Write a protein that binds this ligand. Structure first.
Ligand SMILES: Nc1ncnc2c1ncn2[C@@H]1O[C@H](CO)[C@@H](O)[C@H]1O
Length: 341
RNA sequence: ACAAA
């Protein structure tokens, strides 16, 4: 079987996620060693563990080393079959990153797959769920992927208790993505939420973001959501609707962090992503990699990151040569699929 | 205050 070195490049959880997803899709067994070497708390966390267990269910796999703290995992898949997914991470572990592991596998399963996942919806160092549903899925629709991601209940660090449900359809009609430069920003949209917190938190995040985005000279409409869960939390995502794809920026609240700073951060992130004039923001750039191998096409990104380069390396470890990358890490770049599988 | 990566 193939062995993937989890200390390579970015050295994070994405190496593990992409590996197990591609093992599940291709049927090739995989061993990942040095899991999350380049992270403060190496080895599997609950998020990774439950992602692995769900893929294990879908592919009826044999798994070795699947425990919290493990730096090594062996994943030997059998047949990929559509089954209903139900996952309780048990912590504030990232639902969106669990979905990042699952999505590529679920859409290759030949029948619709429904999922329900509990954990964190809006937690550090991961996509907020509103980013995944409004930016990532929007781009995925363009290559023929159809599904739905619904937030039933928010969950924040540390208690979690968030609930997300949805489904994807089998990816039967694949279409290439061509996303180079945008020529027009049509408008800015967003969702500012606050959970178990005063409603002015959501309103102030939105107002501060709007302030920073006035310079773009386009309409701005940021919806506010007041909700309840088992603990306090807040967050905001904003995105630019362009003539091509949506680019996003986002930020999270925490105790003592002013709502205004939250909103300002998310807006400034969006502004940074727009500056180069490329269609794909730096987060989506890395998230699209496993899908582009099968869809073909070309994306120009605002910034080539180590995440993106590491994801390419994992994908090519399984599928062979796929991509040509024009540009350096930390700068805008161009990623062409020069061989579709 | 390592339930978040
Ligand atoms: N703030 C964020 N917004 C959107 N995606 C994010 C954010 N932070 C991390 N990610 C994504 O989460 C993963 C990090 O392992 C990558 O896919 C990265 O793009």
């Amino acid at each position: 079987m193939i062995t993937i070195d989890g200390s390579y490049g970015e050295g994070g959880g994405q190496i593990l996620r992409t590996s197990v997803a591609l093992s599940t899709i291709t049927g090739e067994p995989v061993r990942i060693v040095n899991i999350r070497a380049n992270r403060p708390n190496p080895g599997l966390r609950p998020q990774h563990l439950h992602a692995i267990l769900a893929l294990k269910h879908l592919a009826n796999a044999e798994v070795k080393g699947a425990h919290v703290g493990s730096r090594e995992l062996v994943f030997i898949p059998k047949k990929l079959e559509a089954k209903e997914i139900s996952i309780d991470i048990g912590t504030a572990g990232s639902i969106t990153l669990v979905l990042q592991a699952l999505l590529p596998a679920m859409v290759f399963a030949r029948e619709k797959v429904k999922f329900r996942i509990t954990g964190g919806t809006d937690v550090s160092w991961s996509p907020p769920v509103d980013y995944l549903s409004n930016v990532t899925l929007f781009a995925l629709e363009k290559i023929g992927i159809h599904g739905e991601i619904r937030v039933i209940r928010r969950g924040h660090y540390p208690k979690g208790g968030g609930i997300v449900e949805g489904y994807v359809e089998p990816w039967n009609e694949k279409r290439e993505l061509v996303a180079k430069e945008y020529s027009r920003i049509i408008k800015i949209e967003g969702i500012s939420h606050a959970t178990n917190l005063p409603s002015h938190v959501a309103e102030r995040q939105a107002r501060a973001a709007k302030d920073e985005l006035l310079q773009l000279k386009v309409p701005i409409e940021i919806r506010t959501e007041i909700s309840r869960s088992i603990g306090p939390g807040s967050g905001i995502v904003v995105w630019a609707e362009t003539d091509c794809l949506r680019l996003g920026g986002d930020a999270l609240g925490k105790k003592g962090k002013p709502a205004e700073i939250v909103g300002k951060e998310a807006a400034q992130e969006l502004l940074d992503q727009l500056k180069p004039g490329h269609c794909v923001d730096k987060f989506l750039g890395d998230q699209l990699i496993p899908f582009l191998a099968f869809s073909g096409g070309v994306i120009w990104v605002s910034e080539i990151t180590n995440h993106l380069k590491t994801n390419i390396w994992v994908v090519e470890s399984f599928l062979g040569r796929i991509f040509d990358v024009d540009g350096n890490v930390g700068e805008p770049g161009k990623i062409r699929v020069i061989r579709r599988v």
